[PDB]
Amino acid sequence: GSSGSSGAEDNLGPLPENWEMAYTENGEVYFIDHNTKTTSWLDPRCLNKQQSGPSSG
DSSP, X not given: OOOSSOOOOSOOOXXXXXXXXXXXXXXXXXEEETTTTEEESSOTTTXXXXXXXXXXX
């Protein structure tokens, strides 16, 4: 029953070189992950465990 989302720093740093943040035609901001060639709605820097293996969301 791990407590709610908790465990982030105040200085993550500028996105890596294997990523590209862009907005769709409509205007939806997304993050392009080349390292794995995957697309996400949220930012990786915030996440701890990158998209490893099969991920529903």
